[PDB]
């Protein structure tokens, strides 16, 4: 028994001689690489996991992963064998991490995900995420640290994180359209489609897009940029870090971020009956918050202007 995906198990026959990275190539079990080893007098009839060797392995780990990267499961694995120690606690009525190996910024993906209408595309992701939500979010993470690139222990950022995993989401029917002027100049309309429909970097207020958004320009004095129109169940408003007054009625919830570039600490905050603040496995409260805030999340139908 060989599978790829845990959902499609290929019977096979095993030899004495040969280790199962001589049959198999590279193989797995229960985290415990393989690959180097024997058969046993035991646990034969055993399910093992395997690169696509060939055309069929292939083929199922692309409909379930929707990636053709030929390291993705290995890197999966490994991630694997570290996220399904963690703990993960209901806090706020939410799945959470409890710190360790720097996190923080999954926790705040996944405390992120639970408030936000968004399906995965790939059946992994679907799967693993319906999963999450119960409080089973081993899989998940180590997805999401597989999608990304990133192995356990980094820290990592939010933004960059949501930007690989929202690829594989179900925006298809997101549109964002945005006019752009310049008072020395004639006036744009650009349109934008997949990630950038929902994701945007340079404010961390949605109204301040709405009311109009300024930058430098590009023929002697600024220019602005305002939404003129919006369809899909959120957007992700995000910037550097800095010092923003989040209300409670405002918005629907956010990440702080304290430290430098370098080195630093996530913590997720959302609005219930009243603002919390989750840093993994602890919840405090406060009616109004005042810190360093780099992505704001907003709940959206259809807006026009
Ligand atoms: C929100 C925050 C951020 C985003 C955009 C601009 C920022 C400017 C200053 C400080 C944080 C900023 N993020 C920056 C990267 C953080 C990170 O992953 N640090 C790990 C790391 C370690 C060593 C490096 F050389 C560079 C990065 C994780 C969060
Ligand atoms: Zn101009």
Same mark, same amino acid.
């Given at each position: 028994?060989?599978?790829?995906?845990?959902?499609?198990?290929?019977?096979?026959?095993?030899?004495?001689? %040969?280790?199962?990275?001589?049959?198999?190539?590279?193989?797995? =079990? @229960?985290?415990?690489?393989?690959?180097?080893?024997?058969?046993?007098?035991?646990?034969?009839?055993?399910?093992?996991?395997? !690169?696509?060797?060939? @055309?069929?392995?292939?083929?199922?780990?692309?409909?379930?992963?929707?990636?053709?990267?030929?390291?993705?499961?290995? +890197? $999966? %694995? *490994?991630?694997?064998?570290?996220?399904?120690?963690?703990?993960?606690?209901?806090?706020?009525?939410?799945?959470?991490?409890?710190?360790? @190996?720097?996190?923080?910024?999954?926790? *705040?993906?996944?405390?992120?995900?639970?408030?936000?209408?968004?399906?995965?595309?790939?059946?992994? !992701?679907?799967?693993?995420?319906?999963?999450? +939500?119960?409080?089973?979010?081993?899989?998940? /993470?180590?997805?999401?640290?597989?999608?990304?690139?990133?192995?356990?222990?980094?820290?990592? @950022?939010? +933004?960059?994180?949501?930007?690989?995993?929202?690829?594989?989401?179900?925006?298809?029917?997101?549109?964002?359209?945005?006019?752009?002027?310049?008072?020395? /100049?004639?006036?744009?309309?650009?349109?934008?489609?997949?990630?950038?429909?929902?994701?945007?970097?340079?404010?961390? *207020?949605?109204?301040?897009? &709405?009311?109009?958004?300024?930058?430098?320009?590009? /023929?002697?004095?600024?220019?602005?940029? $305002?939404?003129?129109?919006?369809?899909?169940?959120?957007?992700?408003?995000?910037?550097?870090?800095?010092?923003?007054?989040?209300?409670?009625?405002?918005?629907?919830?956010?990440?702080?971020?304290?430290?430098?570039?370098? /080195?630093?600490?996530?913590?997720?905050?959302?609005?219930?009956?009243?603002?919390? +603040?989750?840093?993994?496995?602890? =919840?405090? &409260?406060?009616?109004?918050?005042?810190?360093?805030?780099?992505?704001?999340?907003?709940?959206?139908?259809?807006?026009?202007?």
């Amino acid at each position: 028994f060989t599978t790829v995906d845990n959902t499609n198990l290929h019977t096979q026959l095993v030899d004495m001689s %040969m280790t199962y990275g001589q049959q198999f190539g590279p193989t797995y =079990l @229960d985290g415990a690489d393989v690959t180097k080893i024997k058969p046993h007098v035991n646990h034969e009839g055993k399910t093992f996991f395997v !690169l696509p060797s060939d @055309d069929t392995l292939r083929s199922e780990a692309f409909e379930y992963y929707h990636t053709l990267d030929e390291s993705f499961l290995g +890197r $999966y %694995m *490994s991630a694997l064998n570290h996220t399904k120690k963690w703990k993960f606690p209901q806090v706020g009525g939410l799945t959470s991490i409890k710190w360790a @190996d720097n996190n923080c910024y999954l926790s *705040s993906v996944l405390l992120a995900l639970q408030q936000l209408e968004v399906k995965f595309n790939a059946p992994a !992701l679907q799967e693993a995420y319906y999963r999450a +939500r119960a409080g089973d979010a081993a899989n998940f /993470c180590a997805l999401i640290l597989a999608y990304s690139n990133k192995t356990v222990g980094e820290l990592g @950022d939010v +933004r960059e994180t949501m930007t690989h995993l929202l690829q594989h989401a179900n925006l298809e029917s997101a549109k964002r359209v945005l006019n752009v002027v310049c008072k020395h /100049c004639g006036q744009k309309t650009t349109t934008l489609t997949g990630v950038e429909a929902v994701m945007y970097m340079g404010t961390l *207020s949605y109204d301040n897009l &709405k009311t109009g958004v300024s930058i430098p320009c590009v /023929c002697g004095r600024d220019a602005t940029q $305002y939404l003129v129109q919006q369809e899909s169940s959120f957007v992700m408003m995000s910037a550097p870090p800095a010092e923003y007054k989040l209300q409670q009625g405002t918005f629907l919830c956010a990440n702080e971020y304290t430290g430098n570039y370098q /080195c630093g600490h996530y913590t997720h905050i959302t609005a219930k009956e009243t603002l919390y +603040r989750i840093d993994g496995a602890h =919840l405090t &409260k406060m009616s109004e918050y005042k810190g360093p805030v780099t992505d704001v999340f907003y709940k959206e139908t259809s807006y026009t202007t």
